[PDB]
């Protein structure tokens, strides 16, 4: 059972590349759509006790406007990762000058380390994802419309145009897969562009709460 795990890690890496391209971090077209064979040749086809093991396949990227804020990901070897197996990663964070990263766990994370991710959050705004969660770019689905993250200067223009307050908008909770996909804090509004069957196109605005 190594073809399936290789295919699975290939789709994970591909979805992470589309994740980092949609989020804004600079990634090239070569990594954006590679086939299975570039992955197999460049990591080594043997996920069980072989060359494409975890941790030294993990991606680090940089944002497009400046190469100062940087985004790791980390794919842990453990099925259920823990505090002692994330403080290593947080040590790599504080070792660098970087701020934040992803953790794509294999099985469900332990609750204590989830509370840990909560506690050093204002220092390091890092988050997790799941393996089963990341075998599909759910943005590509037909039900999901186009989400765009608004800049604060545009949010001010929005609230000034319609003359309304920040709590009167329709809203979205921080835990749903799209806002967790882009990765956004509360107090941050999101354009949704969707096709209308009555009049063409329609834009709306969900505020993260």
């Amino acid at each position: 059972d190594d073809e399936e795990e290789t295919y699975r890690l290939w789709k994970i890496r591909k979805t992470i590349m589309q994740l980092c391209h949609d989020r804004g971090y600079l990634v090239t077209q070569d990594e954006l759509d590679q086939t299975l064979e570039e992955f197999k040749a460049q990591f080594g086809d043997k996920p069980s006790e072989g060359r494409p093991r975890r941790t030294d396949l993990t991606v680090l990227v940089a944002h497009n406007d400046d190469p100062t804020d940087q985004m790791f990901v980390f794919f842990p070897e453990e099925p259920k990762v823990g505090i002692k197996t994330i403080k290593v990663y947080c040590q790599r964070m504080q070792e660098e000058n970087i701020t934040r990263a992803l953790i794509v766990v294999q099985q469900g994370m332990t609750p204590s380390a989830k509370q840990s991710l909560v506690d050093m959050a204002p220092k390091y705004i890092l988050e997790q994802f799941l393996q089963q969660e990341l075998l599909i770019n759910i943005t590509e689905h037909e039900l999901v419309p186009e989400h765009v993250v608004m800049t604060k200067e545009e949010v001010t223009e929005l609230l000034a145009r319609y003359k309304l307050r920040e709590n009167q908008l329709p809203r979205i909770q921080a835990g749903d897969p799209v806002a967790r996909y882009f990765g956004i804090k509360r107090g941050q509004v999101v354009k949704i562009i969707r096709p209308s069957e009555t009049a063409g196109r329609y834009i709306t605005y969900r505020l993260v709460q």
């Binding site: 600079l26 990634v27 090239t28 077209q29 070569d30 993990t58 680090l60 190469p67 990663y89 790599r92």
Partner: protein, 41 residues
């Protein structure tokens, strides 16, 4: 019109090829830096 269209297409080809090469070189420099700080983690 033929001359104008050929000039425009050659200009767009050169511009896109140049931009892709520059982005590849930026990514390559950052690939060296992330290799240095990634191999240890």
């Amino acid at each position: 019109l033929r001359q104008k269209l050929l000039k425009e297409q050659e200009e767009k080809r050169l511009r896109e090829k140049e931009e892709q090469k520059k982005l590849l070189e930026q990514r390559a420099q950052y690939v060296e830096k992330t290799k240095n700080i990634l191999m240890f983690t």
